[PDB]
Each structure stands twice: as structure tokens, then as C-alpha cells.
Amino acid sequence: ATIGRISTGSKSLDKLLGGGIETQAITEVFGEFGSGKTQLAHTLAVMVQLPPEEGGLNGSVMWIDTENTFRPERIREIAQNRGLDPDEVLKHIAYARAFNSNHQMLLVQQAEDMIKELLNTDRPVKLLIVDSLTSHFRSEYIGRGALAERQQKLAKHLADLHRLANLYDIAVFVTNQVILAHSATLRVYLRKGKGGKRIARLIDGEAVFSITEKGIED
């Protein structure tokens, strides 16, 4: 099946990404606290719901939150300022809080049930967000021997996410607060710049954007 692309809201970032974040891929954004990772996640959760000629995929969203950082009113605000009904946009986000890393892993397997349900409807799941991908793994697997164990568990979790992305034509978008190996298909380093701007660079030019009432934009 052909790849879909979800606009981020920023023409600059979209160009860096070749048009937007891809389905059948895991895109990891990483950066320090406050770099804008969760703002980008909120924006994508609205953009994906737009029709294709506006940069979306007419899609639904599943969101796995590990830090209690999802904000329904931020969704509603971004939606309204982009001409969308805030409550309809929020309705199409299936939200779950992951209590620990083992629950996080089960929630990904659980997500396949809803993905299958919606697959041949007019708003199939097109975006799966895990924010934060790594926070529970970092707190639980620590100390001598933890590097190998944590990386194996993460690799299995990312394998499950790759399978959902590839089997069901979904964009998986994950955040990571930052010598370790990584398994995402594309890694984007995000940082704060001057003038309140955020700067994005692909890892292994740079896009510049602002956080606004529309989510992000140039």
C-alpha cells in the first residue's frame, strides 16, 4: 500500500520530512525537556484528521500517554483555530494512560483491536502516538545490567509498533526526552532556538517553526 503523509502544520518541517510524517514508519522526535515534542504530537493529532488535500489522511488517532501530558483543551484549541469542530476532533482521539512499561507494551497490543475495528470505516486509525516512548523504561530498567535488558524490551516494543504501522498503514509518532542504539525509521532532533522558535534536524538542513494557537506553524 502507498505511503501517506501527515502535514505537521509547518511548511518548513514538512519540507525537512519530505512532505510530512509517513505512514508505515515510526518517527521519533527527541530533545530536551521543553523542546516542543508534545506540542508536535498534539498538532499531528489534529492534522491527521484533515482531508488529504489539506495535509491529513481523514484519520483517527490513538494516543498512549506515559507522563499525563495530553491536554484535551489544547486539541480543541488547535482544531478550532484550523477550522475544525473541537469536539469532533477530540472524539476521534482514543486516549490511554500507560501506568508502567509493561502496561505500555500491552496497550500497543491492545491498540490493534481498535485499529481492526476502524480499518474499513471512513476514519481508520492513521496516527498512533506514544509520548513518552522511553520514560517508563528509563525509570524501571536502571543499574548494572539494565542497558542490555532495557534495549531488548524497547526493541520488542518498537517491533510491535513497526508491525502496526506496516500492517495497517499507520504513522507511529513517538517522543523521547534526551550511545544507545535506536530502531525508529526516522529520528528528528528538536531543540529550542531564538525568538521562541523550535529547530528540527534529521539525524542519521534544519526546519524552524513556532508554537502557536494553531499548534505549530512557520
CSV table of C-alpha atoms in Angstrom, one decimal:
chain,number,residue,atom,x,y,z
A,1,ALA,CA,0.0,0.0,0.0
A,2,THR,CA,1.1,3.5,-0.8
A,3,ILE,CA,2.6,5.7,2.0
A,4,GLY,CA,0.5,8.5,3.3
A,5,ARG,CA,2.0,11.7,4.7
A,6,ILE,CA,0.6,13.9,7.5
A,7,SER,CA,1.5,17.6,7.5
A,8,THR,CA,2.9,18.9,10.7
A,9,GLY,CA,1.4,22.3,10.3
A,10,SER,CA,4.8,23.8,9.5
A,11,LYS,CA,5.8,24.1,5.8
A,12,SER,CA,9.5,24.2,7.0
A,13,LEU,CA,9.2,21.0,8.9
A,14,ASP,CA,7.1,19.3,6.2
A,15,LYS,CA,9.9,20.0,3.7
A,16,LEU,CA,12.5,18.6,6.0
A,17,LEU,CA,10.3,15.5,6.3
A,18,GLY,CA,9.7,15.1,2.5
A,19,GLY,CA,6.1,16.2,2.9
A,20,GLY,CA,5.1,15.1,6.4
A,21,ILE,CA,5.4,12.2,8.7
A,22,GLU,CA,4.9,8.9,6.9
A,23,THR,CA,2.6,6.0,7.5
A,24,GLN,CA,4.3,2.6,7.6
A,25,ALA,CA,7.0,4.3,9.7
A,26,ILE,CA,8.0,5.2,13.2
A,27,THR,CA,9.1,8.8,13.5
A,28,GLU,CA,10.9,9.6,16.8
A,29,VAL,CA,11.3,13.1,17.9
A,30,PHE,CA,13.9,13.6,20.6
A,31,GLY,CA,15.2,16.5,22.6
A,32,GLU,CA,15.5,18.1,25.9
A,33,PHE,CA,12.5,18.9,28.2
A,34,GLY,CA,10.5,21.8,26.7
A,35,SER,CA,11.8,21.4,23.2
A,36,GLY,CA,8.2,21.0,21.8
A,37,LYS,CA,7.8,17.3,21.3
A,38,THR,CA,4.4,17.1,23.0
A,39,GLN,CA,3.2,20.2,21.1
A,40,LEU,CA,4.1,18.5,17.8
A,41,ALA,CA,2.2,15.4,19.0
A,42,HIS,CA,-0.9,17.5,19.8
A,43,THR,CA,-0.7,19.2,16.4
A,44,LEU,CA,-0.3,15.9,14.4
A,45,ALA,CA,-3.3,14.5,16.3
A,46,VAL,CA,-5.4,17.3,14.7
A,47,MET,CA,-3.7,17.5,11.3
A,48,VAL,CA,-4.2,13.8,10.5
A,49,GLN,CA,-7.9,14.3,10.8
A,50,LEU,CA,-7.9,16.8,7.9
A,51,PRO,CA,-8.7,15.6,4.3
A,52,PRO,CA,-5.8,14.7,2.1
A,53,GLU,CA,-5.8,17.9,0.1
A,54,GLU,CA,-5.2,19.8,3.4
A,55,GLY,CA,-2.4,17.5,4.5
A,56,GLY,CA,-4.3,14.9,6.6
A,57,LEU,CA,-5.4,11.4,6.0
A,58,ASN,CA,-9.1,11.6,7.1
A,59,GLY,CA,-7.8,9.5,10.0
A,60,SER,CA,-8.5,8.7,13.7
A,61,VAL,CA,-5.8,8.7,16.4
A,62,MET,CA,-4.7,6.5,19.2
A,63,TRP,CA,-2.6,8.2,22.0
A,64,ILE,CA,-0.6,6.4,24.7
A,65,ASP,CA,0.4,8.8,27.4
A,66,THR,CA,3.1,7.9,29.9
A,67,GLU,CA,3.6,11.4,31.6
A,68,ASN,CA,0.0,12.8,31.9
A,69,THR,CA,0.9,15.4,29.3
A,70,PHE,CA,-2.1,15.0,26.9
A,71,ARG,CA,-4.3,18.1,27.1
A,72,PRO,CA,-7.8,17.8,25.5
A,73,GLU,CA,-8.3,21.6,25.5
A,74,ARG,CA,-5.1,22.0,23.5
A,75,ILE,CA,-6.5,19.6,20.9
A,76,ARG,CA,-9.8,21.7,20.9
A,77,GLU,CA,-7.9,24.9,20.5
A,78,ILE,CA,-5.7,23.7,17.6
A,79,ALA,CA,-8.8,22.2,16.0
A,80,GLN,CA,-10.9,25.4,16.3
A,81,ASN,CA,-8.1,27.6,15.0
A,82,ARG,CA,-7.7,25.4,11.9
A,83,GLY,CA,-11.5,25.5,11.1
A,84,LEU,CA,-12.4,22.1,12.7
A,85,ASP,CA,-15.0,21.3,15.3
A,86,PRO,CA,-13.1,20.9,18.5
A,87,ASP,CA,-15.4,18.2,19.9
A,88,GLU,CA,-15.4,16.1,16.8
A,89,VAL,CA,-11.6,16.2,16.6
A,90,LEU,CA,-11.3,15.2,20.2
A,91,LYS,CA,-13.8,12.4,19.8
A,92,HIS,CA,-11.5,10.8,17.2
A,93,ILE,CA,-8.6,10.5,19.6
A,94,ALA,CA,-8.6,7.2,21.6
A,95,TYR,CA,-6.7,8.0,24.8
A,96,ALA,CA,-4.9,5.7,27.2
A,97,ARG,CA,-2.5,6.3,30.1
A,98,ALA,CA,0.3,3.7,30.4
A,99,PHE,CA,1.0,3.0,34.1
A,100,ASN,CA,4.4,1.4,33.6
A,101,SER,CA,6.4,-0.1,30.8
A,102,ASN,CA,4.7,-3.5,30.9
A,103,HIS,CA,1.3,-1.8,30.7
A,104,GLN,CA,2.6,0.4,27.8
A,105,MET,CA,3.6,-2.8,25.9
A,106,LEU,CA,0.1,-4.3,26.5
A,107,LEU,CA,-1.6,-1.1,25.3
A,108,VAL,CA,0.2,-1.4,22.0
A,109,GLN,CA,-1.1,-4.9,21.5
A,110,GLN,CA,-4.5,-3.7,22.7
A,111,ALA,CA,-4.5,-0.9,20.1
A,112,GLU,CA,-4.6,-3.5,17.3
A,113,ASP,CA,-8.2,-4.3,18.3
A,114,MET,CA,-9.5,-0.8,17.7
A,115,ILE,CA,-7.3,-0.5,14.6
A,116,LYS,CA,-9.0,-3.5,13.1
A,117,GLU,CA,-12.4,-2.2,14.1
A,118,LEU,CA,-12.0,1.1,12.3
A,119,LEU,CA,-9.9,-0.2,9.4
A,120,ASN,CA,-12.6,-0.1,6.7
A,121,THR,CA,-14.6,2.8,8.1
A,122,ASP,CA,-14.3,6.4,6.7
A,123,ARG,CA,-11.9,7.4,9.5
A,124,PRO,CA,-9.5,4.5,10.0
A,125,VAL,CA,-6.7,4.9,12.6
A,126,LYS,CA,-3.9,6.7,10.8
A,127,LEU,CA,-1.8,8.0,13.7
A,128,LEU,CA,-0.5,6.2,16.9
A,129,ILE,CA,1.3,8.4,19.4
A,130,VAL,CA,3.4,7.2,22.2
A,131,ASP,CA,4.5,10.1,24.5
A,132,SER,CA,6.8,9.3,26.1
A,133,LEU,CA,8.2,6.2,24.5
A,134,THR,CA,11.1,5.8,26.9
A,135,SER,CA,10.2,7.4,30.3
A,136,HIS,CA,8.9,4.2,32.0
A,137,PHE,CA,11.8,2.2,30.6
A,138,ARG,CA,14.3,4.7,31.9
A,139,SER,CA,12.9,4.6,35.4
A,140,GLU,CA,12.4,0.9,35.6
A,141,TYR,CA,15.5,-0.6,34.0
A,142,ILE,CA,18.4,1.1,35.8
A,143,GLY,CA,21.8,0.0,37.1
A,144,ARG,CA,24.2,-2.7,36.2
A,145,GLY,CA,22.8,-5.0,33.5
A,146,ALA,CA,20.0,-2.6,32.7
A,147,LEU,CA,21.4,-1.4,29.4
A,148,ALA,CA,21.0,-4.7,27.6
A,149,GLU,CA,17.7,-5.6,29.3
A,150,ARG,CA,16.1,-2.2,28.6
A,151,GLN,CA,17.3,-2.1,25.0
A,152,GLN,CA,15.9,-5.6,24.3
A,153,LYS,CA,12.5,-4.7,25.9
A,154,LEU,CA,12.4,-1.4,23.9
A,155,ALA,CA,13.4,-3.3,20.7
A,156,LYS,CA,10.4,-5.7,21.2
A,157,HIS,CA,8.1,-2.7,21.9
A,158,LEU,CA,9.3,-1.0,18.7
A,159,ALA,CA,8.9,-4.2,16.7
A,160,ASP,CA,5.3,-4.3,17.8
A,161,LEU,CA,4.8,-0.7,16.8
A,162,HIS,CA,6.6,-1.2,13.4
A,163,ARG,CA,4.2,-4.1,12.7
A,164,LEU,CA,1.1,-2.0,13.4
A,165,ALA,CA,2.5,0.8,11.2
A,166,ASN,CA,3.3,-1.5,8.4
A,167,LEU,CA,0.3,-3.9,8.6
A,168,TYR,CA,-2.4,-1.2,9.0
A,169,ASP,CA,-0.8,1.8,7.1
A,170,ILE,CA,-0.4,3.9,10.2
A,171,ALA,CA,2.0,6.7,11.1
A,172,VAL,CA,3.6,5.9,14.5
A,173,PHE,CA,4.9,9.0,16.2
A,174,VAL,CA,7.0,8.7,19.4
A,175,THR,CA,8.8,11.1,21.7
A,176,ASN,CA,12.0,10.7,23.7
A,177,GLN,CA,13.4,13.1,26.2
A,178,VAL,CA,17.2,13.3,25.8
A,179,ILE,CA,25.5,6.0,22.6
A,180,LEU,CA,22.3,3.9,22.6
A,181,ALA,CA,21.0,2.0,19.6
A,182,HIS,CA,17.6,3.1,18.1
A,183,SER,CA,15.0,1.4,16.0
A,184,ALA,CA,12.8,4.2,14.7
A,185,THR,CA,12.6,4.6,11.0
A,186,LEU,CA,13.3,8.3,11.2
A,187,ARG,CA,14.8,10.3,14.1
A,188,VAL,CA,14.3,14.1,14.4
A,189,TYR,CA,16.3,16.1,16.9
A,190,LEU,CA,14.2,19.1,18.3
A,191,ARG,CA,15.6,22.0,20.2
A,192,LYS,CA,14.7,25.5,21.4
A,193,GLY,CA,16.1,28.4,19.4
A,194,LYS,CA,16.0,32.2,19.5
A,195,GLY,CA,12.7,34.1,19.3
A,196,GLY,CA,10.8,31.3,20.8
A,197,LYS,CA,11.5,29.2,17.7
A,198,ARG,CA,12.0,25.5,17.6
A,199,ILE,CA,14.6,23.9,15.3
A,200,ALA,CA,14.4,20.4,13.9
A,201,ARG,CA,17.2,18.4,12.3
A,202,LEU,CA,17.1,14.9,10.8
A,203,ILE,CA,19.6,12.5,12.5
A,204,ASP,CA,21.5,9.8,10.5
A,205,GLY,CA,19.3,21.4,6.6
A,206,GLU,CA,17.1,22.4,9.6
A,207,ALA,CA,13.5,23.4,9.8
A,208,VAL,CA,12.3,26.2,12.0
A,209,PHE,CA,8.9,26.7,13.4
A,210,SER,CA,6.8,28.3,16.2
A,211,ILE,CA,4.3,27.0,18.7
A,212,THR,CA,1.1,29.0,18.1
A,213,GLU,CA,-2.7,28.8,18.7
A,214,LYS,CA,-2.7,26.6,15.5
A,215,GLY,CA,-0.3,24.1,17.1
A,216,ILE,CA,2.9,24.7,15.1
A,217,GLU,CA,3.5,26.8,12.0
A,218,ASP,CA,6.3,28.5,10.3
